[PDB]
Design a protein around this ligand. Structure first.
Ligand SMILES: CN1CN([C@@H]2O[C@H](COP(=O)(O)OP(=O)(O)OP(=O)(O)O)[C@@H](O)[C@H]2O)c2nc(N)[nH]c(=O)c21
Length: 161
């Protein structure tokens, strides 16, 4: 199991928890079957990139929290997309529209990744929103990337730092 690695342009370091991997079949929003290696366990990570940084808390196919800071709207969105994919949420697999086609060297995680970096509107619209507590140093972010002190994309918060 890996504890430091790169994915989606970010450097990940596990800061607590553990996991195991299990091959599973999942069904996209277009009813295409993918085989992915699902991580089971609660883990926390730092994600660091050129234009954004985050703390990610995740469990088995579940994003628990993402606290993200970044240079601008597009950079923050890029980090959110990678976190959503990395979480392996079925919500995210079901947000695929059309087929995921072959590319040499691209495993299904990177197929998903490629798909949503092209256009994340369906992912953002179908992920879920939640009411948020007013917690110091954080704010919500809505599907359309606007700030909110009242609501947010589920599990997602934006920090200054
Ligand atoms: C969802 N992931 C993915 N991941 C690790 O992220 C790494 C990068 O994912 P990737 O590029 O799909 O993997 P790669 O090295 O190409 O192969 P593979 O995904 O099959 O391991 C892999 O080592 C993978 O096991 C994880 N590592 C931990 N600890 N916890 C996790 O939840 C996850």
């Amino acid at each position: 199991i890996s504890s430091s690695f790169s994915f989606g342009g970010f450097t990940f370091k596990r800061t607590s928890g553990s996991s195991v991997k299990k091959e599973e079949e999942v069904l996209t929003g277009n009813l295409q079957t993918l085989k992915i290696r699902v991580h089971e366990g609660y883990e926390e990570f730092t994600m660091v990139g050129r234009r954004a940084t985050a703390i990610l808390r995740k469990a088995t196919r579940r994003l628990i929290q993402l606290i993200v800071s970044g240079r601008d709207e597009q950079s923050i969105a890029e980090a959110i997309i990678v976190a959503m994919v990395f979480s392996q949420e079925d919500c995210m697999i079901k947000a695929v529209r059309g087929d995921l086609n072959f590319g040499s060297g691209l495993n299904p995680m990177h197929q998903l990744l490629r798909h949503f970096q092209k256009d994340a509107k369906v992912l953002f619209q179908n992920w879920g929103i939640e009411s948020i507590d007013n917690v110091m140093g954080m704010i919500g972010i809505l599907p359309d990337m606007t700030p909110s002190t009242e609501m947010s994309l589920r599990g997602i918060r934006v920090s200054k730092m």
